[PDB]
Write a protein that binds this ligand. Structure first.
Ligand SMILES: Nc1ncnc2c1ncn2[C@@H]1O[C@H](COP(=O)(O)OCCCCC[C@@H]2SC[C@@H]3NC(=O)N[C@@H]32)[C@@H](O)[C@H]1O
Ligand SMILES: Nc1ncnc2c1ncn2[C@@H]1O[C@H](COP(=O)(O)OCCCCC[C@@H]2SC[C@@H]3NC(=O)N[C@@H]32)[C@@H](O)[C@H]1O
Lengths: 322, 322
């Protein structure tokens, strides 16, 4: 009903204490009995709620569904995010964000359980299954020149990798400039875009797609040997609210780093975290394709590459295959 | 009514020949009498239409109102523009365009008779009076790297100036990088913005604001000594459809130049057209303000400036006062 999110919100807020039906009824000004029906419906959708006579209700565990009422708590206590929008299904969080940023200076993010028109780079398809991943767009408002886009993209990467690392017992590496791998499986793809003019960035929009709970059986045959999910590398059930919380904590740490530090302070760390060294890489640029070795990441974030013909290149971005 | 634009469209299309009520009625499948009422209404709004017994109607002159039905002809015969949106009044053509470009690759423009929330640079106000100017946003789709924004902005300037020049008997000059002057009056301001990532521009959005028919009495006292309109420098009535047509012709000429030429081919021309030389300029950058002389425009479009302290600067953009 109308009141599901509000009831869920009260339950999240009151953890680890129990609140009574009666007390929830008073808050929202509805009947005890409507409170019971709302609570029955949440259990039926897979909320795990302990109901104890004389004590009331305790939210123990959420299902793999995003709830606006819970996300609203994440933004209230956030110093960086003014608000969020949550969707069950939508064309793309990235389209939605590019539409919502117009005409304001808010910082916010958009999450959706499924995307029907998920896009990565160069208009490629990004598989966004219902219930199985974090499909998110983040909009921020750095006072910086439009050339700083690349450097933002370097910082955010370490933020995402760190948040996935906390949950996998296997190594999580960055594949510059736009993906996160565990072994040979891409677990995340992200993409940083901007609205800007000669005078400055108007918004950064970072699209982040993270495979959370797919089994191998869940990926299309076409990508199944090069894709993985956090669950496939975590011995405990992966909890999506716990992940989101850590993801937002890291994004904010790295965003403040971005505003305050040169790339040179994180370069070594980025280097050590990267899986592009010591192996043959395939590069695509429009017509050309070529092979190459990543030699180095320079102090401004360019990849130094020696191609198979011995020519050296200095790249602000690329798309690489392994 | 429902049919005004369609009737106007047929009338524009049939110039310089007359079409009959009867014939317009057949086209749209409506009664002769509804055609007469639609025609009476257009005259009453200031369309000048010659109605001759036995011959029919000829559109002779439009009022200072934009009509979607006429703009639809401009886009049908345009190779560059897929479509246009026309409004009587709206917050800003620039907001509207940034919302309409999302999720497609169309090229288009948006015109509005008035803007209630017109913005120039740095969130400054742009005065957009009903009936008095061309308030327009243009969206294009160059396959180019995000650093080419500045160079686009140089080409478009010569396009706009040329189109205003055709109508003023006084000199029209460019004030780099964002305004067009006739004598000491700013007649136009324009602003180039982009949506982009490391891989390329997704859209260019050029906001163009041109004072067409204001008298001095029409400008706010605060800007009246530094503003002017095309009418104040044209001995004939300024006709807004004729202007728009020439504006679109030049924008397309210069946009193709942009795609095909280095800035070095137009540099001299831009130079010769500019009013920033040989005079003291005021520069603002965040905290600082300083005075300076424009020395030169280099082959990549940077302004070379000698400031009052004798230090030289190389600027991709600036805001200058005279
Ligand atoms: N779920 C998946 N897991 C592993 N491999 C996959 C997946 N889906 C597609 N792929 C493979 O990865 C490529 C990813 O593209 P990318 O262009 O490198 O793209 C970088 C990224 C984009 C981030 C997408 C986020 S989701 C939230 C936001 N909304 C949106 O439309 N995109 C961003 C695809 O061609 C395909 O090979
Ligand atoms: N009508 C006017 N004529 C002469 N002076 C004026 C006018 N309105 C304001 N001004 C003065 O010019 C400054 C223009 O700002 P700019 O930031 O250089 O701005 C560059 C420009 C922006 C182009 C505006 C177009 S209109 C179509 C599109 N939509 C939108 O909101 N803006 C663009 C203002 O501070 C004020 O001094």
């Amino acid at each position: 009903s109308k009141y599901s999110q509000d009831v869920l919100q009260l339950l999240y807020k009151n953890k680890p204490n129990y609140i009574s039906g009666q007390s929830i009824a008073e808050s929202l000004n509805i009947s005890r009995t409507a409170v019971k029906k709302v609570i029955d419906q949440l259990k039926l959708e897979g909320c795990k709620i302990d109901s104890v006579n004389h004590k009331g209700h305790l939210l123990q565990q959420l299902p793999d569904i995003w709830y606006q009422g819970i996300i609203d708590q994440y933004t209230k206590s956030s110093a960086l995010f003014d608000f969020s929008e949550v969707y069950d299904s939508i064309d793309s969080t990235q389209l939605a964000a590019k539409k919502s940023l117009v005409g304001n200076q808010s910082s916010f993010f958009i999450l959706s359980d499924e995307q029907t028109k998920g896009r990565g780079r160069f208009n490629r398809h990004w598989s966004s299954s219902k219930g199985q991943g974090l499909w998110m767009s983040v909009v921020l408002r750095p006072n910086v020149a439009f050339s700083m886009i690349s450097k933002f993209n370097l910082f955010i990467a370490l933020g995402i990798r760190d948040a996935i690392q906390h949950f996998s017992q296997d190594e999580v590496k960055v594949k510059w400039p736009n993906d996160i791998y565990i072994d040979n499986g891409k677990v995340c793809g992200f993409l940083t875009e901007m609205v800007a003019n000669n005078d400055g960035i108007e918004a950064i929009i970072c699209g982040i797609g993270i495979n959370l709970t797919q089994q191998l059986e869940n990926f299309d045959e076409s990508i199944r040997h090069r894709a993985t999910s956090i669950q496939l590398h975590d011995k405990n059930k992966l909890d999506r609210y716990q992940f989101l919380e850590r993801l937002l904590q890291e994004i904010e740490k790295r965003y403040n780093q971005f505003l305050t530090l040169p790339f040179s302070e994180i370069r070594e760390e980025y280097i050590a975290a990267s899986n592009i060294w010591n192996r043959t890489l395939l590069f695509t640029e429009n017509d050309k394709q070529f092979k190459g070795q990543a030699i180095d990441l320079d102090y401004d974030g360019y990849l130094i590459v020696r191609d198979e013909a011995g020519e050296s290149h200095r790249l602000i971005s690329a798309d690489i295959d392994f």
